[PDB]
């Protein structure tokens, strides 16, 4: 259910593979930020989710460095995959920039991303 191409509401594109070993691999292309072109992502997901019918927990990270640019920052998405005819991957994320210790207080942005097929 997770393997595939996914899109968030910012227009970003999440390309991923969910391996049988609980691993997540692919690329992310931000529609915003100090970004351009695809960035490597990787993460993990629950390969044996609950019987009851709850979403499948997962999470992944992108460090915003690629051959084209480096924003000295990383985002992690934490959320759950939700099957349906309207499958969704519902996330909250944390984006931390490298800062001096003085500015550490403002190092991290927080947001929410909803991904659709």
């Amino acid at each position: 259910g997770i393997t595939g191409t996914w899109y968030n509401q910012l227009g970003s594109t999440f390309i991923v593979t969910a391996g049988a070993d609980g691993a997540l691999t692919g690329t992310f292309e931000s529609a915003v930020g100090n970004a351009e072109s695809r960035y490597v992502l990787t993460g993990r997901y629950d390969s044996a989710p609950a019987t009851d019918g709850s979403g499948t927990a997962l999470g992944w990270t992108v460090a915003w460095k690629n051959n084209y640019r480096n924003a000295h920052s990383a985002t992690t998405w934490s959320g759950q995959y939700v099957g349906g005819a309207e499958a969704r991957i519902n996330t909250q994320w944390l984006l931390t920039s490298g800062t001096t210790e003085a500015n550490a207080w403002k190092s991290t942005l927080v947001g929410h991303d909803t991904f659709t097929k």
Copy 2:
């Protein structure tokens, strides 16, 4: 650097390998919550950090399933590594549990972990 065995304020053990490609790989062992023994982890980090004094942005994910147990959940840690004198990794984290859609408002915990050696 970032490669090594680290411990957070809770006494959790974070065993990690920072690859020249920007990969993070190791194991996480949780002192608390619905967990036992080590869990696979994967993440990303800025392989070419700023030099002026900024920390090195990083992130990683744990899906809380292994050979012994499954919490049907996953945490992502987002933070910056601060090295030199007493190296530190300062993070913020999101722990998302699979849930029913009606319980989704209460799927995600938020916190902060600080790690040293």
Copy 3:
């Protein structure tokens, strides 16, 4: 334009008054969790927002104690009012529960609520 009766995506009811000094006062009624009927809320908003299309920052707090129940918890919403046809209030919130110190790591839930009238 903040003064009014708002509903979030969960169906909870936010009845607010934005005073001329920057105060938010009213009641919150949650459709979910360990709550029933109305709770006092209080908070602040930017009385002089910029005039560049930027939204209006605000925040409020509810302690989940009232004459019928006490969950021994508090939520705070931080966000901005967005004017227009579809006037909206977009927030992120933090729900802290009184825990012991050993359980504090899991004291705080995080989410995001969008309100309309």
Copy 4:
């Protein structure tokens, strides 16, 4: 145990009164950011906490507008008060700044502040 003067790790000064009804009122002075002098705060706390050694849930909001300047932004702190010889208020916070809708994705900073007497 909450009424009085408290200090966070960043130097800021939180002067607060916890009223009998669960009211938090007072004033915040920030050592950091787009702030000068003191700002009004208001919030709520659990005035009937548990007796099982659990902490006391509370939160407050600051809108960063006062007589001297306006950052067009607001912070909410959500946390719990822990008394004893080593009394503290442990919080996590969300700082939302007014922004256009296109920049809403980067509107909110998240962090944590520990307050001491």
